Paper text:
To perform a deeper analysis of the amyloidogenic properties of the identified PAM4 region, we next synthesised a high purity (>99%) peptide corresponding to this segment (matching residues 350–362) and characterised its ability to assemble into amyloid fibrils in more detail. Specifically, we were able to identify 2D-classes containing potential two (65%), three (28%) and four (10%) protofilament polymorphs assembled from conserved core folds. The structure of the two-protofilament morphology (PAM4 Type 1) was determined at 2.6 Å resolution, with a helical twist of 359.32° and rise of 4.86 Å corresponding to a crossover of 125 nm. Each protofilament contained six PAM4 subunits, giving a total of twelve subunits per layer of the fibril with each protofilament comprising a head-to-tail ring of PAM4 peptides. The lower abundance, larger fibril morphologies of the PAM4 peptide fibrils could not be resolved to high resolution but appeared to contain the same protofilament building blocks as PAM4 Type 1 with increasing assembly sizes. All four of the PAM4 fibril structures are inferred to be left-handed from the resolution of the cryoEM maps, as well as from cryo-electron tomography (cryoET) reconstructions of Type 1 fibrils. Interestingly, the folds were interchangeable within the different fibril types, with Type 1 contaning FoldA and B, Type 2 fibrils containing FoldB, C and D, and Type 3 and Type 4 fibrils containing FoldC and D. In the FoldA-FoldB building block (seen in PAM4 Type 1 fibrils), the FoldA subunits are similar to FoldB but bend further around the GS region to cap the end of the adjacent peptide chain. FoldB PAM4, which has a flipped N-terminal compared to the previous fold, perfectly matches the 4R PSP-derived tau fibril cores and shows a C-terminal mismatch to the 3R PiD tau polymorph.
Numbering used by the authors:
A (entry chain J), B (entry chain V), C (entry chain h), D (entry chain W), E (entry chain i), F (entry chain K), ...: 350 to 362
The structure:
């Protein structure tokens, strides 16, 4: 597996 | 698997 | 699998 | 639940 | 649920 | 739960 | 106001 | 105001 | 005000 | 606003 | 705002 | 605001 | 038993 | 039993 | 038993 | 009131 | 009132 | 009041 | 309110 | 209110 | 309020 | 058995 | 048995 | 047995 | 969730 | 959920 | 959760 | 048994 | 048994 | 048994 | 991305 | 990215 | 990234 | 195999 | 194998 | 094997 992610936001308000 | 993702938002308001 | 995604929004208001 | 209220008056007279 | 209310008056007189 | 209230008056007279 | 009232309920949910 | 009241409830949830 | 009241409840949750 | 939700799932695979 | 939620899941795999 | 939540999970794998 | 009474008058004149 | 009464008058004149 | 009474008057004149 | 009564019963169950 | 009564019964069940 | 009564019963259960 | 109940079962299996 | 109930079962399996 | 209850079971298995 | 329940209420009034 | 419950209420009023 | 419960209330009023 | 199992065999050979 | 199973075999060979 | 199991075998061979 | 296997999963929920 | 296996999982929930 | 195994997991929850 | 591959062979002879 | 691969062989002979 | 691989062979002969 | 090749490319994306 | 090759590339992404 | 190679690359990402 080769992965590239810029930004990751997992948010609960 | 080769993946490229710019931005990922998983949000609950 | 070769994937390219610009922006991903998974949002619940 | 996402909520927005400007003004709220619960008044007994 | 996404809600927007300007003004709310619950008045007994 | 994300909430925003400007003003709230719970008044008995 | 100048009344005879058994039960008075002024409620906001 | 100038009344005869058994029970008075002014409630905001 | 100038009343006869059995029970008075002014509650904010 | 008066809201009741049994179950909520906001999921990204 | 009066809210009741049984269960909530905001998950990214 | 009056809120009741049974369970909450904000998880990133 | 779940009961709610506003006013009760048991009066003999 | 689930009961709600506004006013009750049991009066003998 | 769950009971709520505003006012009670048991009066003999 | 100004009467002749053998038995007087004013009962609320 | 100004009467002759043998038995008086005023009952609320 | 100004009467002749054998038994007077004013009861609230 | 006058109530008479023989047996009451509120059960979750 | 006059009530008479033999048996009451409120059950969830 | 007049109440009479034989047996009360509030059970969670 | 694989079970998922959001909310459960077993209530007697 | 594999079980998941958000919220549970077994209540008698 | 594998069990997960968010909240539990066994209440008698 | 109410469950009853007589026997269970999860076997790899 | 009320369930009854006599026998269960999950076997890989 | 109410559960009853007679026998359980999780065996790797 | 006498095999070439990449991944083996024998699962019971 | 007499095999070549990368990953073996025998799981009961 | 007489095998070459990378990871072996025999788990009961 | 949610992916599942049984077997992959990238072979140059 | 959520990925599952059984077997991978990148072989040059 | 969530990844699961059974077996990996990067071999040069 | 027994050949004359300038460039060899065996790629899996 | 028994060849004359300038460049050999065996790549898995 | 028994060859003449300028560059050999066997890569797993």
């Amino acid at each position: 597996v080769q992965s590239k992610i810029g930004s990751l936001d997992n948010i609960t308000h």
